[PDB]
C-alpha cells in the first residue's frame, strides 16, 4: 500500500554504529542492510568481498544494472570507500510501495567505513546533491525516489535508545503516532547538510552566554549518521567545565571527558541527577522566535557494556554536529518541501525521575541573523 504503519519500526541497529533500514537493489531483488545517514548525499553499498560484510552487492546477477562508466570515491570522518557508479532499481521492503532506478556507488575498495559486525553493508546518504561526489550533478537517491513517484518531498525520524537499538524512517510523511504535543520547526539554512543555526544554549537553566556564532562555527547539522553532540572547540569546552561543576561530588578519569575511558556505577546506582540538562535553542519561522530542545544526561551518557557510560559529547573543528545521541527521543521531521526541521518528543522518549527531554516553545530571540556564520 505504502501507508506510513509500514514503515514504523524499519529501523535497527547497534549503539555507536548508526541506524540502518532494509533495502533491495537489482532485478532480480539482491536485500541489504543499508545505513540512513542525514550526514551525506551518497547512495553507496558493498560490491565485493569484505572481512566485515556478510553479503554484497553483486552487478553480474541483476538484469536491470546498468553501468555508468565513472568511478567515485567518499572520504567521512573516520572511513571512505571508493568504487564504480552504475544505476540500478531500487526498493525499500518496508517503506512506500515504489521501486525507482537510483544512482548507486558500488564499494569494490574501503578503509576503515564497514564495521566488524554491524549488520550493514551499505548507506544511504539523505542530504543534498551540494555535498554529493563526484559532484553536485550525481542525483541522491531521495531526489530520484521524489522526482520519480508521487511521494512526498519529506521523511522523518524516529531513532530510539536502548545493546540493539531500533527505530523508524517515515518516507513521504510524518505519522502522529510517533510523537507527543507540538512539532517544532527550524529552517533548513542552506541546502547542503542539514544546516541550521543555534541562537542560545543553556546548561541546567544557566545560558553559556557565548556569542552566538560560535554555537554554529562553521555550521550547525542535524546528521543521524554521526552519534555524539560535537561542538565547536570553544563551546566544548565552556559546556564541559560546566559539566564537570555540576557533577564533581564524583571522581572521573581524565579520558572520560575526552571520550576514551568508560565510567562505571554499580548496576542501577547511575547519580543522573548530578549530570546537568542541555538545552538548545533553535531558530524559529516567524522573526525573533526560537524554540529549544532539551537534552537528559541519558542522551550523552551513551550506555556501553555495572553500568558503564562513555561521555557522548566532543570536540569538533568543523562546526556543531547534533548527532544520533540528540536525535534519540526526539521525532526529527526533514521537511525539505518546506525547508524546515520539525522537532517533537518522541513516542520513544527517554526516562528520568524527576526530569523531562522536552521541545518548547516559542520564545524571544533578537538578532538571530547575526548567529549565522560567514566568512
Ligand atoms: C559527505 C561526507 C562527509 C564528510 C565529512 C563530514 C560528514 C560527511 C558529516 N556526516 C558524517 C556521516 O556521513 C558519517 C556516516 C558514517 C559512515 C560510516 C560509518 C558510520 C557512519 C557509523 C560509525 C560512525 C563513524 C564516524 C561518523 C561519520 O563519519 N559518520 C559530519 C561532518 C560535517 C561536520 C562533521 O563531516
Redesign the pocket.
Known sequence: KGSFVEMVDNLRGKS???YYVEMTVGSPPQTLNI?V??????FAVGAAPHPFLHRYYQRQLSSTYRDLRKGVY??????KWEGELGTDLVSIPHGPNVTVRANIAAITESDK???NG?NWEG?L?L?YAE???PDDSLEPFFDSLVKQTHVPNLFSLQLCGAASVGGSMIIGGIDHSLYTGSLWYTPIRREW?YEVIIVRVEINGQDLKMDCKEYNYD?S?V?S???NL?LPKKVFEAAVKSIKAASSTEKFPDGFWLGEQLVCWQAGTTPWNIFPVISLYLMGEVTNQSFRITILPQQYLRPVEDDCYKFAISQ?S??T?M?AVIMEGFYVVFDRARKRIGFAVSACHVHDEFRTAAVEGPFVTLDMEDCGYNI
Open positions: 555507536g554504529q548508526g545505513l545517514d542525514t550526514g551525506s548525499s551518497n567518499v572520504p567521512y570522518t573516520q572511513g567505513f564497514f564495521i554491524s548507506i546518504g542530504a555535498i554529493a561526489r547538510y555550521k547539522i546528521d549518521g554521526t552519534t560535537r569538533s568543523t562546526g554536529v548527532g
